[PDB]
Symmetry: D2
């Protein structure tokens, strides 16, 4: 993948969360997520996909991934998906927007989903 | 997984798209997605996660998945993530909201991401 | 306004909420919103804007509006904005997506904002 | 309004856009918006609402507003709604997420709506 090397490794967001990812030659994203906030402790499994053959016109590299907030420690009955783009270079970034859906009753389903935005960098 | 059997199989959304998914005992989602709309043809790899031990209080089952819109036929330099919940029973549903991010230049990054909502059923 | 007559009046969404709106010749939306759900009772002031000169090519009419969830009965320290389009005809609809932001501390700001989708019709 | 004085005035976002707003004692927002980006030129009318009696616990002030992208110069057949919170103090901010809906045909309605985030400050 063009950005396999660029994407693979450890990222930090503005909240102090840790995203550890391996990008596969085939478009796979695999790794672990550790949230600094919310009903979460330690690492959670993540999986996702990225564009392994992006445009060569200076566009970013589209990608996304999912965490279900269940591990051996806690279950927050929720899942977050991050949708965004990898921008390479000296200050590489992954700029994302995310949706967090909780399991709810039908009565509360209107309030099931949060939306936010996270920016990941290789330092901090 | 409590809804492993309920989630695994073929789903159809309101657009006529086809979502074919296997839920793993461990929270994994693996399969293929075929979009009826947009810059897409044939099947794309998807991966995601679901809550394999949901609440027993009648709440839905949180889940999410990603497609990168690259296959052997086309590359739309984009990725969609669906975030939502599985609601079991006679008329099982997956109710989602999604983010579609395109790879963009810095100049166009403000316009990178669409948001929408898809409802998947086992028929149609 | 091209859809001034079409938009002006009483609308109902899938939750049983009531949206009473007047569209001005100049693009203004003014009225009241009554939510069937959440921390809400009776009517709240709404204001917004619509495209008073839409495309003639069968496209819908872009529009949006805001409710701050404060009235003489309650204050939910939150505001919802609906963004969407009016689609005219026998079964007229306003198809929206919405963002609900709560006032939060800096610590909880990552969880400030819900996202959802409401469809309004002239009946039910 | 508790933050009537804090909110009223000229704001700038990260894109270089200009938001000029008056907050009314009653919860009204009225003003003009000038976008640095997209299919836009000069000022557009905006209207919205804010929580005129926010919590006294250090929480921000919920607010939202709408622009329909029609003025005497251009019509982009679209509307943006910003939903967010005002955070007072030495470096006052309005932290928003936004939905931009275009008028579309029914065929293209799945792609009608962009989502993004803007942060407004009193300088730059």
């Amino acid at each position: 993948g063009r950005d396999e090397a660029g994407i693979t490794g450890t990222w930090y967001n503005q909240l102090g969360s840790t995203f550890i990812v391996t990008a596969g030659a085939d478009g796979a994203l695999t790794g672990t997520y550790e949230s600094a906030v919310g009903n979460a402790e330690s690492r959670y499994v993540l999986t996702g996909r990225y564009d392994s053959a992006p445009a060569t016109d200076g566009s970013g590299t589209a990608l996304g991934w999912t965490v279900a907030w269940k591990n051996n420690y806690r279950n927050a009955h929720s899942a977050t998906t991050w949708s965004g783009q990898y921008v390479g270079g000296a200050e590489a970034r992954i700029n994302t927007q995310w949706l967090l859906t909780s399991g709810t009753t039908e009565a509360n389903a209107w309030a099931s989903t949060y939306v936010g935005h996270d920016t990941f960098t290789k330092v901090k």
